[PDB]
Amino acid sequence: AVNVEKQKPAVSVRKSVQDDHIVCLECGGSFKSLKRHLTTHHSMTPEEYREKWDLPVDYPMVAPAYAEARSRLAKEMGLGQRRKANR
């Protein structure tokens, strides 16, 4: 790939939203959910990560309309319950 002081700038924000695919800032690759990929590879929380790229309005890391583009309203970054309650 590269990763020698440059990384992959997936352009500026605003157009980070594409056709049901969200572009991986620092990485280049595209997917439906950066939330996972983020905490997997780049690791850390989506809100903490937006700080790195100075990403305005705390730009969502999940699909453009996944859940009202706003974590389904409330339920902050992290995990609700550490349990798979109900099937």
Side-chain angles (χ1 to χ4, degrees):
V2 58
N3 201 75
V4 287
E5 279 119 91
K6 190 78 105 298
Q7 290 158 294
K8 253 275 174 170
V11 296
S12 190
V13 71
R14 195 176 187 175
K15 278 177 171 174
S16 318
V17 165
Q18 294 184 73
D19 198 315
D20 276 277
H21 58 267
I22 199 156
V23 75
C24 188
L25 278 299
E26 215 100 72
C27 216
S30 195
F31 43 36
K32 64 278 186 173
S33 55
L34 177 51
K35 58 126 295 203
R36 201 139 118 75
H37 170 102
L38 204 279
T39 309
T40 307
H41 292 338
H42 325 264
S43 67
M44 305 171 294
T45 60
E47 268 77 278
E48 220 79 329
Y49 172 71
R50 85 76 144 108
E51 291 265 278
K52 169 56 192 281
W53 286 81
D54 312 298
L55 231 58
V57 78
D58 51 272
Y59 181 76
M61 304 309 165
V62 206
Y66 176 74
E68 202 70 271
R70 216 176 197 223
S71 65
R72 208 199 179 194
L73 198 150
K75 220 177 183 72
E76 66 170 321
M77 69 297 176
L79 51 101
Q81 275 66 43
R82 54 160 179 65
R83 238 289 185 136
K84 217 283 167 172
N86 235 284
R87 183 179 166 181

PDB file of all heavy atoms in Angstrom, residues 21-36:
ATOM      1  N   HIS A  21     -22.181   3.711   0.285  1.00  0.00           N
ATOM      2  CA  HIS A  21     -20.818   3.395   0.735  1.00  0.00           C
ATOM      3  C   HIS A  21     -20.125   4.663   1.253  1.00  0.00           C
ATOM      4  O   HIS A  21     -20.294   5.747   0.699  1.00  0.00           O
ATOM      5  CB  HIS A  21     -20.007   2.666  -0.351  1.00  0.00           C
ATOM      6  CG  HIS A  21     -19.849   3.391  -1.693  1.00  0.00           C
ATOM      7  ND1 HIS A  21     -20.638   3.247  -2.755  1.00  0.00           N
ATOM      8  CD2 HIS A  21     -18.767   4.048  -2.093  1.00  0.00           C
ATOM      9  CE1 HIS A  21     -20.034   3.792  -3.806  1.00  0.00           C
ATOM     10  NE2 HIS A  21     -18.876   4.293  -3.393  1.00  0.00           N
ATOM     11  N   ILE A  22     -19.517   4.497   2.418  1.00  0.00           N
ATOM     12  CA  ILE A  22     -18.851   5.576   3.170  1.00  0.00           C
ATOM     13  C   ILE A  22     -17.330   5.340   3.121  1.00  0.00           C
ATOM     14  O   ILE A  22     -16.855   4.220   3.321  1.00  0.00           O
ATOM     15  CB  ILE A  22     -19.502   5.636   4.572  1.00  0.00           C
ATOM     16  CG1 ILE A  22     -19.239   6.985   5.245  1.00  0.00           C
ATOM     17  CG2 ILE A  22     -19.124   4.468   5.501  1.00  0.00           C
ATOM     18  CD1 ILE A  22     -20.313   7.303   6.294  1.00  0.00           C
ATOM     19  N   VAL A  23     -16.626   6.373   2.666  1.00  0.00           N
ATOM     20  CA  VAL A  23     -15.182   6.278   2.357  1.00  0.00           C
ATOM     21  C   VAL A  23     -14.286   6.373   3.611  1.00  0.00           C
ATOM     22  O   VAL A  23     -14.498   7.211   4.490  1.00  0.00           O
ATOM     23  CB  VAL A  23     -14.853   7.270   1.223  1.00  0.00           C
ATOM     24  CG1 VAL A  23     -14.804   8.743   1.647  1.00  0.00           C
ATOM     25  CG2 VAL A  23     -13.613   6.824   0.446  1.00  0.00           C
ATOM     26  N   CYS A  24     -13.318   5.458   3.692  1.00  0.00           N
ATOM     27  CA  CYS A  24     -12.477   5.307   4.866  1.00  0.00           C
ATOM     28  C   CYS A  24     -11.399   6.393   4.825  1.00  0.00           C
ATOM     29  O   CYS A  24     -10.543   6.390   3.941  1.00  0.00           O
ATOM     30  CB  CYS A  24     -11.871   3.905   4.952  1.00  0.00           C
ATOM     31  SG  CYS A  24     -11.030   3.683   6.563  1.00  0.00           S
ATOM     32  N   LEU A  25     -11.614   7.463   5.584  1.00  0.00           N
ATOM     33  CA  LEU A  25     -10.548   8.462   5.807  1.00  0.00           C
ATOM     34  C   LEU A  25      -9.333   7.770   6.453  1.00  0.00           C
ATOM     35  O   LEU A  25      -9.478   6.753   7.135  1.00  0.00           O
ATOM     36  CB  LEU A  25     -11.040   9.641   6.666  1.00  0.00           C
ATOM     37  CG  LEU A  25     -11.817  10.767   5.955  1.00  0.00           C
ATOM     38  CD1 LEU A  25     -10.969  11.458   4.884  1.00  0.00           C
ATOM     39  CD2 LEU A  25     -13.168  10.312   5.394  1.00  0.00           C
ATOM     40  N   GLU A  26      -8.145   8.200   6.026  1.00  0.00           N
ATOM     41  CA  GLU A  26      -6.830   7.611   6.388  1.00  0.00           C
ATOM     42  C   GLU A  26      -6.496   6.284   5.662  1.00  0.00           C
ATOM     43  O   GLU A  26      -5.314   5.983   5.508  1.00  0.00           O
ATOM     44  CB  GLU A  26      -6.714   7.396   7.907  1.00  0.00           C
ATOM     45  CG  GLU A  26      -5.316   7.604   8.488  1.00  0.00           C
ATOM     46  CD  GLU A  26      -5.191   8.986   9.128  1.00  0.00           C
ATOM     47  OE1 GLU A  26      -5.800   9.155  10.210  1.00  0.00           O
ATOM     48  OE2 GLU A  26      -4.608   9.874   8.475  1.00  0.00           O
ATOM     49  N   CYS A  27      -7.484   5.672   4.995  1.00  0.00           N
ATOM     50  CA  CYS A  27      -7.378   4.303   4.520  1.00  0.00           C
ATOM     51  C   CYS A  27      -7.639   4.297   3.013  1.00  0.00           C
ATOM     52  O   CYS A  27      -6.816   3.811   2.238  1.00  0.00           O
ATOM     53  CB  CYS A  27      -8.329   3.369   5.269  1.00  0.00           C
ATOM     54  SG  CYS A  27      -7.548   1.728   5.492  1.00  0.00           S
ATOM     55  N   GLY A  28      -8.774   4.857   2.566  1.00  0.00           N
ATOM     56  CA  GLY A  28      -9.116   4.946   1.129  1.00  0.00           C
ATOM     57  C   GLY A  28     -10.275   4.018   0.730  1.00  0.00           C
ATOM     58  O   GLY A  28     -11.191   4.437   0.026  1.00  0.00           O
ATOM     59  N   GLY A  29     -10.193   2.767   1.207  1.00  0.00           N
ATOM     60  CA  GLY A  29     -11.237   1.734   1.011  1.00  0.00           C
ATOM     61  C   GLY A  29     -12.644   2.199   1.432  1.00  0.00           C
ATOM     62  O   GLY A  29     -12.796   3.139   2.208  1.00  0.00           O
ATOM     63  N   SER A  30     -13.657   1.537   0.890  1.00  0.00           N
ATOM     64  CA  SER A  30     -15.064   1.924   1.133  1.00  0.00           C
ATOM     65  C   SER A  30     -15.917   0.745   1.625  1.00  0.00           C
ATOM     66  O   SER A  30     -15.641  -0.409   1.300  1.00  0.00           O
ATOM     67  CB  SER A  30     -15.650   2.520  -0.147  1.00  0.00           C
ATOM     68  OG  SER A  30     -16.868   3.198   0.163  1.00  0.00           O
ATOM     69  N   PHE A  31     -16.954   1.086   2.385  1.00  0.00           N
ATOM     70  CA  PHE A  31     -17.849   0.129   3.083  1.00  0.00           C
ATOM     71  C   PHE A  31     -19.158   0.769   3.572  1.00  0.00           C
ATOM     72  O   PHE A  31     -19.328   1.985   3.507  1.00  0.00           O
ATOM     73  CB  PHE A  31     -17.126  -0.521   4.280  1.00  0.00           C
ATOM     74  CG  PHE A  31     -16.294   0.438   5.145  1.00  0.00           C
ATOM     75  CD1 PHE A  31     -16.708   1.743   5.388  1.00  0.00           C
ATOM     76  CD2 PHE A  31     -14.971   0.090   5.383  1.00  0.00           C
ATOM     77  CE1 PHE A  31     -15.802   2.707   5.797  1.00  0.00           C
ATOM     78  CE2 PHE A  31     -14.066   1.047   5.816  1.00  0.00           C
ATOM     79  CZ  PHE A  31     -14.489   2.348   6.036  1.00  0.00           C
ATOM     80  N   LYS A  32     -20.100  -0.071   3.995  1.00  0.00           N
ATOM     81  CA  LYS A  32     -21.337   0.393   4.657  1.00  0.00           C
ATOM     82  C   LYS A  32     -21.153   0.918   6.096  1.00  0.00           C
ATOM     83  O   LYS A  32     -21.886   1.806   6.526  1.00  0.00           O
ATOM     84  CB  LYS A  32     -22.471  -0.647   4.596  1.00  0.00           C
ATOM     85  CG  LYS A  32     -22.244  -1.977   5.330  1.00  0.00           C
ATOM     86  CD  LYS A  32     -21.416  -2.982   4.524  1.00  0.00           C
ATOM     87  CE  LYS A  32     -21.358  -4.325   5.252  1.00  0.00           C
ATOM     88  NZ  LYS A  32     -20.703  -5.349   4.426  1.00  0.00           N
ATOM     89  N   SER A  33     -20.239   0.318   6.863  1.00  0.00           N
ATOM     90  CA  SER A  33     -19.984   0.739   8.255  1.00  0.00           C
ATOM     91  C   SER A  33     -18.508   0.878   8.655  1.00  0.00           C
ATOM     92  O   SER A  33     -17.834  -0.072   9.058  1.00  0.00           O
ATOM     93  CB  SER A  33     -20.750  -0.145   9.252  1.00  0.00           C
ATOM     94  OG  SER A  33     -20.447  -1.529   9.066  1.00  0.00           O
ATOM     95  N   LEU A  34     -18.059   2.130   8.633  1.00  0.00           N
ATOM     96  CA  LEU A  34     -16.754   2.526   9.194  1.00  0.00           C
ATOM     97  C   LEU A  34     -16.698   2.326  10.715  1.00  0.00           C
ATOM     98  O   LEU A  34     -15.667   1.853  11.166  1.00  0.00           O
ATOM     99  CB  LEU A  34     -16.363   3.957   8.779  1.00  0.00           C
ATOM    100  CG  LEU A  34     -15.062   4.554   9.348  1.00  0.00           C
ATOM    101  CD1 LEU A  34     -13.836   3.659   9.165  1.00  0.00           C
ATOM    102  CD2 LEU A  34     -14.781   5.877   8.635  1.00  0.00           C
ATOM    103  N   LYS A  35     -17.817   2.452  11.442  1.00  0.00           N
ATOM    104  CA  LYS A  35     -17.859   2.224  12.911  1.00  0.00           C
ATOM    105  C   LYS A  35     -17.047   1.001  13.389  1.00  0.00           C
ATOM    106  O   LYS A  35     -16.099   1.157  14.157  1.00  0.00           O
ATOM    107  CB  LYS A  35     -19.300   2.158  13.458  1.00  0.00           C
ATOM    108  CG  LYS A  35     -20.192   1.075  12.827  1.00  0.00           C
ATOM    109  CD  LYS A  35     -20.869   0.109  13.813  1.00  0.00           C
ATOM    110  CE  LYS A  35     -19.870  -0.772  14.573  1.00  0.00           C
ATOM    111  NZ  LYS A  35     -20.464  -2.015  15.087  1.00  0.00           N
ATOM    112  N   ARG A  36     -17.251  -0.121  12.695  1.00  0.00           N
ATOM    113  CA  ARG A  36     -16.540  -1.381  12.956  1.00  0.00           C
ATOM    114  C   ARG A  36     -15.087  -1.321  12.460  1.00  0.00           C
ATOM    115  O   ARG A  36     -14.191  -1.314  13.298  1.00  0.00           O
ATOM    116  CB  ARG A  36     -17.327  -2.554  12.362  1.00  0.00           C
ATOM    117  CG  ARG A  36     -16.918  -3.866  13.030  1.00  0.00           C
ATOM    118  CD  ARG A  36     -18.150  -4.734  13.295  1.00  0.00           C
ATOM    119  NE  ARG A  36     -18.082  -6.011  12.560  1.00  0.00           N
ATOM    120  CZ  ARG A  36     -17.332  -7.077  12.851  1.00  0.00           C
ATOM    121  NH1 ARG A  36     -16.540  -7.132  13.916  1.00  0.00           N
ATOM    122  NH2 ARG A  36     -17.399  -8.150  12.079  1.00  0.00           N
TER     123      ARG A  36
END
